[PDB]
Amino acid sequence: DEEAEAKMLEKYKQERLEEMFPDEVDTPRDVAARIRFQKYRGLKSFRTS
Amino acid sequence: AKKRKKKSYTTPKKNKHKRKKVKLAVLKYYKVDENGKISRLRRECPSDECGAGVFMASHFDRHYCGKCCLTYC
Amino acid sequence: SLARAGKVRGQTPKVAKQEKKKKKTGRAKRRMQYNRRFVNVVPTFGKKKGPNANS
Amino acid sequence: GVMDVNTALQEVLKTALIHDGLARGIREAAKALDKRQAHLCVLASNCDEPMYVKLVEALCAEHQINLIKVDDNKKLGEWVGLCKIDREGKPRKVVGCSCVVVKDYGKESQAKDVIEEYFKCKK
Amino acid sequence: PRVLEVYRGVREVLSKYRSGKLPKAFKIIPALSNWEQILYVTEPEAWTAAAMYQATRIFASNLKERMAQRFYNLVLLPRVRDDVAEYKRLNFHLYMALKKALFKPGAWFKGILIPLCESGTCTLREAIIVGSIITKCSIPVLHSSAAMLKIAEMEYSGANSIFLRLLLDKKYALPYRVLDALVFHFLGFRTEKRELPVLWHQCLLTLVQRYKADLATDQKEALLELLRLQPHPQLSPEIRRELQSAVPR
Amino acid sequence: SSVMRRNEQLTLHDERFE
Ligand SMILES: [Zn+2]
């Protein structure tokens, strides 16, 4: 019963950290960055690339 | 101005080395007879300043002083 | 190409307004205005400070 | 025979507290007792170890020290003043002392008369 | 004679000391009789920061408060005053050295605090650093109260209010003669025409939040008159409101 | 020694300054 409330407050904290910081996701220090972000690529500009 | 994210990161430092606590160490200094006589298990130092109070740590072979670093065999 | 609609209004952080006491309205407001500019006058050599002058 | 022993004891403890003549606890209370610079010994009756009481009695009998026995140690910590007080004086630090040794006396005319009278009545 | 070569060698050791186990002749220095001559041979002005920290640890560990008193008065405080004036900050090892010197409060109060605040040349940075070092260390009530009374008795400087406020921040129970002396001190600023810094106002403030339960009516109105005669656009209403919102005894 | 005095409600400790 309280697990749903804890998840709801975790969702509130995630939304608060999503608005005051838009899309910053912390790099994990256990997994290599090229493995966890294997499918991610860099764009020179979001409109023209 | 621009704010920082303050990356959290967990690292367990709860385990730190601490010396073992000796409880009721006054028991081994003296032995008390049934009549009421006191027997001193440990040597008393004839030092210049800390005499008549300081007992000796008993090594495997030798007795050692803990205030003035007195040496014996 | 480009042409966002309502980017900054929906993207700005939302801060709620503070709760303050209500302002005097009517003749009381004009009284408070009058005894601020002409009654408790502060002597100044050049009068370089406005009403909203901050820092 | 005007004022009681259990107030003269706190008066002696206070006069020792100004004059810095209190050996409190276990280790200062024992080694200064054997140095013949100490005078009186006070032990808590509420004890967890009996040969502690035997050792205190043996130390008192060896150097003819008069022994005073009080019921429990937390009240003794209240008597001595081993408590941290507020501005009003409310204690939050409840630490009980077992061996209370009086080294030096304050020159008293009321508490001293009572404690020597009690010592003469006892002995 | 023959000991002079050994102490010259350990003097040369201390001039380049960084860490490691010290020679055993240094650890038995307070057990000596003519220890001042030995200390002058070891040349404390040429010691390093870690060596001086370990020297302070050794002298604090070996009791005899008068020797630690004279060591703090003669050696440690001039080096601190030289080091703050040069690098504008205190080193880590010397900071730990003053902490290990506060391992003995009695020699520290008469040796580091009182000579610095009685010299009159104590700057702001020295006062802030040292007062933070008192703030770090838990202190006896009687010792801090006597330091309070002594600071309240001596002449006013900009540095002294910093120590006074940071000792007020310890929030211990105060003897009432000390409260009388500090009230007399602040009432000694009743007729002063000198402009007072914000540190004096903050010290008086923290006094009024903490010790408002032990203020009698006469000194309450006296501090109200002090606020009347020496005002501040921001801090004086705070002290005034804390005065009208106080219960005695 | 000052003039104004704490007057009422208890003195827990004498305090040592001498
Ligand atoms: Zn030793």
Non-local (6+) Cβ contacts of E98 within 8 A are E56, E76, E80, E108, E112, E130, E133
User: Which DSSP helix (H) or strand (E) runs through C18?
Assistant: none
* Cα–Cα distance, F5 to F17 (Å, whole number): 18
Q: Which of F11, F13, F15, F18 to mutate to test the interface with D (most CBs of D within 10 A)?
A: F13
Does residue D81 sit at the F interface (CB-CB below 8 Å)?
yes
Cα–ligand 1 centroid distance for A21 (angstroms): 60
Q: Name the 3-class secondary structure at B31.
A: strand
Q: Name the 3-class secondary structure at E216.
A: coil
Non-local (6+) Cβ contacts of E170 within 8 A are E135, E139, E144
Number of separate domains in chain E: 1
**C-alpha distance from residue F12 to each of A30, D14, D25, D85, F15 (Å):** 59, 10, 22, 9, 9
Q: What residues form DSSP beta bridges with B58?
A: B63
* Cα–Cα distance, D82 to D99 (Å, whole number): 13
Do residues E25 and E14 touch, judged by C-beta distance below 8 A? no
Full DSSP string of chain D = --S-HHHHHHHHHHHHHHHT-EEEESHHHHHTTTTT---EEEEESS-S-HHHHHHHHHHHHHTT--EEEES-HHHHHHHHT-S---SS---------SEEEE------SSHHHHHHHHHHHH-
Non-local (6+) Cβ contacts of D74 within 8 A are D94, D96
Q: Name the 3-class secondary structure at E162.
A: helix
**C-alpha distance from residue B37 to each of B34, D28, D89, E222 (Å):** 7, 21, 44, 67
* Cα–Cα distance, E22 to C46 (Å, whole number): 71
Find tokens 């104004």 and name the residue. Answer: F4
* Cα–Cα distance, C27 to A48 (Å, whole number): 61
* Cα–Cα distance, E8 to F14 (Å, whole number): 50
* Cα–Cα distance, E76 to E71 (Å, whole number): 7
* Cα–Cα distance, B62 to B68 (Å, whole number): 16
Chain D positions contacting chain E at CB under 8 Å are: 85-89
Resolution of this structure in Å: 3.3
| Residue E111 CB burial class (10 angstroms; 0-12, 13-18, ≥19) | buried
Full DSSP string of chain A = -HHHHHHHHHHHHHHHHHHSSSS--PPPSSS-HHHHTTT----S-TTT-
Residue E98 sits in which domain range?
Answer: 2-249
Taking contacts as CB-CB distances below 8 angstroms, the residues of chain E near D88 are 213
- Torsion, Cα E2 E6 E8 E9, to 10 degrees, reads 150
* Cα–Cα distance, B38 to B42 (Å, whole number): 12
* Nearest chain F CA: its distance from D18 CA (Å): 7
Please tell me what DSSP assigns to residue C21: P
* Cα–Cα distance, E53 to A32 (Å, whole number): 43
End-to-end Cα, chain F, rounded Å: 14
Q: Name the 3-class secondary structure at E200.
A: helix
* Nearest chain F CA: its distance from E184 CA (Å): 7
For chain C, the residue count is 55
Non-local (6+) Cβ contacts of B62 within 8 A are B72, B73
Is the C-alpha dihedral spanning A37, A40, A45, B2 positive or negative? Answer: negative
C24 conformational bin, left if phi > 0, alpha if psi -120 to 50, beta if neither = beta
Please tell me what DSSP assigns to residue B38: E
Do residues E137 and E98 touch, judged by C-beta distance below 8 A? no
Q: What residues form DSSP beta bridges with D70?
A: D44
Residue from the list A19, A20, A47 with its beta carbon closest to the beta carbon of C1 = A47
